[PDB]
Amino acid sequence: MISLIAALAVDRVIGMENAMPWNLPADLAWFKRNTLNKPVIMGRHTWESIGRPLPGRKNIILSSQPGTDDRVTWVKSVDEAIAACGDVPEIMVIGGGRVYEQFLPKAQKLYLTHIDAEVEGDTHFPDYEPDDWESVFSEFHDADAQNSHSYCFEILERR
Numbered sequence: 001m002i003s004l005i006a007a008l009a010v011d012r013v014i015g016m017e018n019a020m021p022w023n024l025p026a027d028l029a030w031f032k033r034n035t036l037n038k039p040v041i042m043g044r045h046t047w048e049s050i051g052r053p054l055p056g057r058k059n060i061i062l063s064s065q066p067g068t069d070d071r072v073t074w075v076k077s078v079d080e081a082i083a084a085c086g087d088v089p090e091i092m093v094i095g096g097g098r099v100y101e102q103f104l105p106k107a108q109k110l111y112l113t114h115i116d117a118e119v120e121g122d123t124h125f126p127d128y129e130p131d132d133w134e135s136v137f138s139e140f141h142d143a144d145a146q147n148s149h150s151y152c153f154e155i156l157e158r159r
């Protein structure tokens with residue numbers, strides 16, 4: 001099973017200038033809980049944005065060019081990325097925009113954080129078709145001293 005996990009600001013913005021400009025510790029904790037002990041697939045730009053391997057996860061990087069770091073696994077196509085995960089129950093696709101586009105048609109589950117923040121950005125999560133997806137979990141949180149925007153954790157499953 002393939003799942004996508006992402007945090008979306010208003011208008012599906014996910015990034016600006018190869019960064020995420022907000023800081024929501026509660027959402028990073030949610031990301032860690034839902035990805036730990038699973039393989040994670042990311043594109044090369046997202047790898048450069050994170051800047052280091054994510055511990056406790058098999059890190060698989062998509063790039064058309066040879067890898068430059070043997071602490072992670074480098075693959076050259078979507079099918080190779082999936083194969084490199086082996087026989088696991090759930091593969092997590094962690095972006096960015098171009099990678100989400102390619103894996104969306106193959107995904108059964110979306111883990112989305114909706115952040116109440118207006119962000120100028122240059123990268124968006126794909127338009128998906130709402131009729132294809134059932135919301136199976138949602139949890140709203142007001143802003144607090146640690147998290148400066150309100151946010152909604154949602155899990156959607158392909159109908």
Ligand SMILES: NC(=O)c1ccc[n+]([C@@H]2O[C@H](COP(=O)([O-])OP(=O)(O)OC[C@H]3O[C@@H](n4cnc5c(N)ncnc54)[C@H](OP(=O)(O)O)[C@@H]3O)[C@@H](O)[C@H]2O)c1
Nearest residue numbers: 006007015018019043044045046063064095096097098099
């Ligand atoms: N808010 C969130 O949830 C979230 C999550 C992830 C990322 N982001 C943000 O998203 C932005 C990065 O997204 P992006 O769309 O620019 O880039 P991306 O999807 O991270 O990376 C694209 C790169 O991945 C490689 N790639 C993708 N598909 C491939 C394929 N089928 N075969 C081979 N290589 C492939 C290519 O690398 P080569 O050029 O080396 O071939 C391509 O240039 C940043 O702003 C980041 O902060 C946000």
Ligand SMILES: Nc1nc(=O)c2nc(CNc3ccc(C(=O)N[C@@H](CCC(=O)O)C(=O)O)cc3)cnc2[nH]1
Nearest residue numbers: 005006007027028029031032050054055094095113
């Ligand atoms: N909901 C969501 N939020 C995100 O921030 C997110 N980020 C990415 C890609 N970028 C990043 C950037 C940093 C870290 C990171 O530092 N993660 C630590 C945080 C642990 C914690 O704060 O408790 C990790 O070990 O996962 C992960 C992904 C992909 N999907 C996402 N999905």
Ligand SMILES: [Mn+2]
Nearest residue numbers: 077078079080
């Ligand atoms: Mn092929």
Ligand SMILES: [Mn+2]
Nearest residue numbers: 083086087088
């Ligand atoms: Mn197999």
Ligand SMILES: [Mn+2]
Nearest residue numbers: 116117149150
């Ligand atoms: Mn806000």
